[PDB]
Each structure stands twice: as structure tokens, then as C-alpha cells.
Design a protein around this ligand. Structure first.
Ligand SMILES: O=C(O)c1ccccc1O
Ligand SMILES: O=C(O)c1ccccc1O
Lengths: 141, 141
């Protein structure tokens, strides 16, 4: 039916976008997951547990991505002054610059794929799928 | 902006749905990927190359899923009568029954998450995102 098709189309869109984003972000030496980590830390330091849960990936996956971004000088592991074991992933000046370039790549791709939709159509879809998102997040966790 | 948010929301919806589908399909002894393989073969035999490309996963990932479904008796590797090396993955009677149960689980979840949307709203979203899908598939491959 139509409700199943909306979800299946959302899934197909995600896979195709993922493939293309990995390709375009590649020029910035980033994978889609690496970019997501930068996106998440761009507005404030995040725990590695948050990153794994928010993006539904394994802890080893986050560990690999963070280690990579750290070596690239895009993020740093900040430790509490009294308990060094408490770690937060913080974006660096260079990380923010790279994240910004990544946003432009994302922006350009988004404009291309939604090209057949008018501004009003875009708005109509956005407001309605935001409801779907609220519901699935309430259900899934 | 709005166009970037539509794509980012589509991604967040996909991840949350993936998490929940893996949980609910678990009672059928299937992972989301296993179910997708059944979905793909439900309407006709598919090559392993097609499965990996269509769902954007690695060949080893498809190999593992097919081996599992084969052991579960849900699919079989059919070989050409003159060139046994040419392989197609075909769904079995039992596979179709399991796939059908999987569809009902998907249907129920889809109805829950799109619950705030009227039938007309559902239709409006579906027709518009179908355009987005057409475009990203043209771009990505
Ligand atoms: O990706 C999905 O969740 C899906 C579900 C049903 C039918 C086709 C699909 O791609
Ligand atoms: O998942 C995405 O592609 C995404 C992109 C931009 C901002 C937040 C996001 O989750």
C-alpha cells in the first residue's frame, strides 16, 4: 500500500544518497560516517556512546571514525580535569572548516535531487515527514 | 535550508526504521538485510551482484545473508543447465511464507509511524519523494 511504499522509498533514497555522498565526500578525505561525526560535534562536544547510538553504528565503527578524524586533526579527545577517563569528542578549527565544506557538498547534492520540487512542495514534504521521524524515534527507543 | 533538511530527515528516518525492523524481524530469525534479499527474490530469481548493488552492501555481506537464508531453507542457488557457474538466488515456498510474514511486520510498523498523516497526506508525500528517488538514482549510478 501507500504507507509501506513511503517507507520503502525513504529507504531507497537513503541508500542512493549514501552511495553518492561517500563518493563526493571522498574528495574531502571523509566517509559519510566521518562527516556525520563532524556534523554531530560541530555544535558541541559529544560522547562516543552518543555518536554510536545517534547514527545506529557499532562502537568499533565510531572508534575507527574518531581515531581517523583525530589523526586528520579534525577532532580531539577532551578529558575531564579530575577524571581523565570521561571523554568527549570535540571538533577543531580545521574540523569545522572541513565540516563546512562537507555541508556545501551536501547542499549542492540536495538541491540536485529535489530539483523537480518547488519550494512549496519541498516545505509540504518536510513538515509531514518530520512527523514520521518523531514517531519512529518514539517507537524505536 | 529546507532541501538539506528533507534529505537529513530521510536519513534519520531510515536509521530509526532500520533499528526497529531489525528488532521486529528478529522474531522471524531475519535481519533487515536478510528480509531485503527475500523481498528482492520474491518476484523472481536475482544474481548476487544485483543484490549487492541494489541494497548498497558488500558482496561478502550478500554472501553471508544468502548462505544464511539457504541454510534456513528460504532460498536456493539455481545453476544454469550447461554452465553451473552462472548462479541465481531463488526464493523457496518457505521463503515466500516468511517474506509474507515480514511484509505484515513492515506494514504494521509503517502504519504506526505514518499515523499522524491522513491518507491524502500520505499520497502527497509519496508522489513527491518518488521524484527525489528517480533523480538520486540517475545521479548515483
Ligand atoms: O527498503 C525497504 O525497507 C523496502 C521494504 C519493502 C519493499 C522494498 C524495500 O526496498
Ligand atoms: O544524515 C544526514 O545525512 C545528515 C545531514 C546533515 C545534518 C544532519 C544529518 O543527520
Amino acid at each position: 500500500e501507500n504507507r509501506i511504499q513511503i517507507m520503502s522509498t525513504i529507504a531507497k533514497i537513503y541508500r542512493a544518497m549514501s552511495r553518492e555522498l561517500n563518493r563526493r565526500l571522498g574528495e574531502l578525505n571523509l566517509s559519510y560516517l566521518d562527516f556525520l561525526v563532524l556534523r554531530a560535534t560541530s555544535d558541541g562536544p559529544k560522547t562516543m556512546a552518543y555518536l554510536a547510538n545517534r547514527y545506529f553504528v557499532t562502537q568499533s565503527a565510531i572508534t575507527a571514525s574518531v581515531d581517523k578524524l583525530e589523526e586528520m586533526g579534525l577532532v580531539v579527545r577532551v578529558r575531564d580535569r579530575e577524571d581523565r577517563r570521561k571523554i568527549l569528542i570535540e571538533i577543531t578549527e580545521k574540523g569545522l572548516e572541513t565540516f563546512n565544506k562537507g555541508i556545501e557538498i551536501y547542499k549542492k547534492l540536495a538541491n540536485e535531487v529535489t530539483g523537480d520540487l518547488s519550494e512549496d512542495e519541498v516545505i509540504l514534504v518536510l513538515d509531514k515527514i518530520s512527523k514520521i521521524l518523531k514517531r519512529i524515534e518514539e517507537i524505536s527507543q
